[PDB]
């Protein structure tokens, strides 16, 4: 469990193991006093670098729980097809409704 | 980026359709039960889209 | 127990002992003729400060009876968040209907 009032606490695995919904209220219930007794070893700019890599890895975990809601992502653009010498590489204008009943 | 991947997504009921109205359906993410401070789907509702 | 027809009966406890709904009826069903034999000792305008403090506290009573109906007051403006060194603070423009099914 990471503590958001200390820069030397947040790692990538502490944010990823916490859920996306649980990441909302954990950041809103922190401490207003910022502690400077133990800073991050890569500087204060490096603690921003470590925290947000765990959020984008949690979007991949959110896509797993919603894999029964959307479909397999088709290739979007040209140049990517298995058999290109008889048919071209298609690509979707993704304006549809990705939804599984 | 810290408030783009910051939203409230309720899980859909088994066998139910998609939420379309933020005003009535509480499973809609822009519903006033989901409009928390400091988030962007409430900022989808502060600036109404 | 307050009585509206005399100056020196209304105190702070006398206004808040009756709620918002009952204060509609008893002030619309009070006496026309004002008595003046023993006025309010801080003057007849001093009790004007004494009554109306119980009204804005009487919707904090109605805030509790609708705490199972309305929402928690989110900060309407920025600057109010526990963490401001990694994430910003929004503020909810409270155009929404405080309404819990």
Curated annotation (Swiss-Prot), chain B:
Role description: Self-assembles to form an icosahedral capsid with a T=16 symmetry, about 200 nm in diameter, and consisting of 150 hexons and 12 pentons (total of 162 capsomers). Hexons form the edges and faces of the capsid and are each composed of six MCP molecules. In contrast, one penton is found at each of the 12 vertices. Eleven of the pentons are MCP pentamers, while the last vertex is occupied by the portal complex.
Q: Which family does it belong to?
A: Belongs to the herpesviridae major capsid protein family.
The protein's name is: Major capsid protein
Compartment(s) = Virion; Host nucleus
Q: How does it assemble?
A: Homomultimer. Makes the hexons and eleven out of twelve pentons. Interacts with triplex proteins 1/TRX1 and 2/TRX2; adjacent capsomers are linked together in groups of three by triplexes, heterotrimeric complexes composed of one molecule of TRX1 and two molecules of TRX2. Interacts with scaffold protein; this interaction allows efficient MCP transport to the host nucleus. Interacts with capsid vertex component 2/CVC2. Interacts with the small capsomere-interacting protein/SCP.
- Source organism per entry reads Human herpesvirus 2 (strain HG52)
Source species, domain of life = Viruses
